Chains A and B, each alone.
Chain A
Amino acid sequence: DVVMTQTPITLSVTIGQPASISCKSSQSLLDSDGKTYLNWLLQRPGQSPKRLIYLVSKLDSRVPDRFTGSGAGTDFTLKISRVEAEDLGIYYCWQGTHFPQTFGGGTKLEIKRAEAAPTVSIFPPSSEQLTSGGASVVCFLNNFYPKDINVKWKIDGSERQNGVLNSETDQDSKDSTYSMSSTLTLTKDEYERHNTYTCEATHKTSTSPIVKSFNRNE
């Protein structure tokens, strides 16, 4: 297969600013018929791929002219003159000159917005769950930016590395924030041996960890 390598791999851009993405092929994309079968596609979160550009620089008629493609041979570029909210997603290049057609691995465009502090909530395991022999402590960290966040759990003052599962949402279309859930799962008997459970978030919106906690005694 013809390798298609995209750069950069992720990109954060402010609405109204330009962006550029590069695609490099392991060999020339010129077909013997003289055309160069290189396309660019966008996939918005939870949707299908959409075609932006075909034959290197032709604009799909459903797509606005803020998108332009250039290049030749093995080197190709997509440019966005001016980024809009709707341009959030993953961009892919594609070649259909050589068999089998190949796609590049994708470039993720995120919308840069103002820093936003997470709203952090902590929840004790339900009694229902405890009857299964298991216990899950749940921590929500909602509507924050930038995405990078470190969440640490403590039990009676000590960091608990294992038993933690995290899930992140994709960037929100209305306010451009991210949210995350972190879950500490223990056995009921382990859960019932300790008093203080804490979720601590490190995030650039505070100079200390953002902390929520509860005590099993109540």
Chain B
Amino acid sequence: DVQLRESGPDLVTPSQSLSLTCTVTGYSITSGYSWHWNRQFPGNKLEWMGYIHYSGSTNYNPSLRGRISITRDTSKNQFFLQLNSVTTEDTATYYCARYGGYWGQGTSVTVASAATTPPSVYPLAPGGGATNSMVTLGCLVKGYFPEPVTVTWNSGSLSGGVHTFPAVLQSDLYTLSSSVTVPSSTWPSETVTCNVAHPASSTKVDKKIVPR
């Protein structure tokens, strides 16, 4: 019942090294197979980076100079990636993997010199009126870094009619939006609040969506 679990930093500065850990369970990394690091770039293309063999030898893609090493801790059943001199081109989702169709959940890594920055949170309330039985409200979350942010609505009791859009770059920081659609019978007569969490900056913001 083989499982693979990657962990390590969200954000690395250019030129520095990136180190990740893959924690393997349900199979001993000394008992067989090669144990691989792969990565997926924005745009979905996949590259194999290297492996550590059960004997402990290593083989690396020519495309990663000698700036990649893989090591292991056979006592904890973990193997490790280290990629040095990183650049914007190494920004990616990193996956540990084994033959037989086993992949980790993946871990996303951005490489930037931009600083961790907490979000502003703006409410989206409609202008001066329409008849209809449903209303759409939203939140605009702007100028935070790095990914991710979470958005919930009224602490998650509103999940049904929600769309939270992928973040886009905007002046070297991220901006996302989310919309929620509720019965006009319930807003504005009841409160709708967007809850925004930005873990990198240790921030939670609640914004109430008020009419006009």
Chain A: residues with Cβ within 8 Å of the partner, total of 47
State whether the Cβ of B118 lies closer than 8 Å to any Cβ in chain A: no
Q: Is the CB of B101 within 8 A of A142?
A: no
Chain A positions near chain B (C-beta within 8 angstroms): 1, 43, 48-51, 54, 60, 62, 90, 92, 94, 96, 99-103, 105-106, 119, 121-126, 128-129, 132, 136, 138, 140, 142, 165-169, 179-181, 183, 185, 214-215, 218
Which chain A positions have C-beta within 8 A of B47? 103
Which residues, 103 to 152 on B, are CB-close (under 8 Å) to A? 103-106, 120, 122-128, 136, 138, 140, 142
Q: Is the CB of B140 within 8 A of A48?
A: no
A60-B101, A142-B181 given; A128·B163 CB < 8 A:
no
Q: Of B59, B127, B163, B176, which is within 8 A of A124 by CB?
A: B127
Which chain A positions have C-beta within 8 A of B168? 165-167
Q: Complex Cα distance A121/B101, Å?
A: 44
Chain B: residues with Cβ within 8 Å of the partner, total of 40
Q: Complex Cα distance A121/B137, Å?
A: 9
Minimum Cβ distance to chain B for residue A15 (Å):
23
Q: Complex Cα distance A197/B168, Å?
A: 22
State whether the Cβ of B57 lies closer than 8 Å to any Cβ in chain A: no
Q: Is the CB of B165 within 8 A of A62?
A: no
Q: Is the CB of A123 within 8 A of B124?
A: yes
Which chain B positions have C-beta within 8 A of A166? 168
Which chain B positions have C-beta within 8 A of A129? 120, 122, 140, 142
21 contacts between A and B (CB under 8 A): A48-B95, A60-B101, A100-B62, A105-B44, A106-B44, A119-B181, A124-B127, A125-B122, A126-B125, A126-B140, A129-B120, A138-B140, A140-B179, A142-B179, A166-B168, A167-B166, A167-B177, A169-B166, A180-B165, A181-B165, A214-B127
State whether the Cβ of B65 lies closer than 8 Å to any Cβ in chain A: no
Q: Is the CB of B179 within 8 A of A181?
A: yes
Q: Complex Cα distance A39/B135, Å?
A: 48
Q: Is the CB of B140 within 8 A of A169?
A: no
